[PDB]
Amino acid sequence: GINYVQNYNGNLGDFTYDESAGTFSMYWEDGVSSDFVVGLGWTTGSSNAITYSAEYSASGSASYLAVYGWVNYPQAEYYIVEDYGDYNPCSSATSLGTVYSDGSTYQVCTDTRTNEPSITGTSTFTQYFSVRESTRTSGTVTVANHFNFWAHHGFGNSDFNYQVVAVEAWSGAGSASVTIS
Template sequence: MVQLSRLAASLLVPAGVLAAPAAESKLQRRFDGNGFNNWSEGGSNIKCVNGPGGSFTADWNSQGGFVCGKGWNGQGDRTITYSGTYNATGPGYLAIYGWTRNPLIEYYIVESHADLAPNEPWTSKGTFTIDEGTYEVFTATRVEKPSIEGTRTFEQYWSVRQEKRVGGTVTTGKHFQQWAQLGMNLGTYDSVIVAVEGYTAQGGSGSAGSAAIEIE
């Protein structure tokens, strides 16, 4: 069982921040550097920096929540290849992170993490093995919390990788298929990013980032 920790609020992907969907050629599928996302609530020592191509860095030593990363508008069943780093204490993770609408769902495919142990009603739905790893699936309900549609009540879907890694390939459609078999249905894809997120209510620190991101 993966130990999960409380996250103070759902983290947002502001409208208009992400790059347009990737074009058809292999070269154009490589991240063009325009979809940088940087959001925080509180904390005075959180630094997220956009880099060239699919690179970004995050450094923090503070209380407060943040998320930063790079991604695309839309995007459903895709293969995302990334490489990066992640070294942290306190609640936080490196994940493929996104939203859908109708229904409004916030979803996470967690590749690596520090502390994850929520004091809220998470429900384990079992495990499955894909992309050379085993993931445990969780659901949670956020009641009147911030979302891409304002303050709403919505579901969270989580796949948490048991063998932590900071680089590899994530086939999002395989997760979506497993979730659907559990009755966890997504809506219309709004956005997806390779993200670093942390919530350090008790204080935490770390450094993380991506060196490259590619989508197919």
């Protein structure tokens, strides 16, 4: 029951959505050289499972097909990356382990962003990432398995701000078309 539309620089590409149908698409087939994050979701996140289906094409693009959201305190930005382009965030970040969920292992890592854009303006926050090793573009994400693993490493696992299925990119070109079931 979609009630939040995520649009962070959606203007850099062609973002279309229908909250009633639970569908959206994003074309950035001419390329982008700045960050966008677009998607559909809920004003308050939870640990309920999310089922989605997508056509996602982002080879040669620093991009993610991800469940994305925030925790108010301790302030954290989080990603459960189902598929991605050229860039793996865990290659550079502090490794936390591996979690197994919904048919694959996920590399888990963390990072700290200082004086960067956040749900409160500009601030310092922690990032948690689960990056799928056998990437896919459809399935169920049992969000609770990721939240419970990250909670061992300081993730607040309560006091949630928004949560969306999102497409992000900051370079390259591609397209995406997603349905949330």
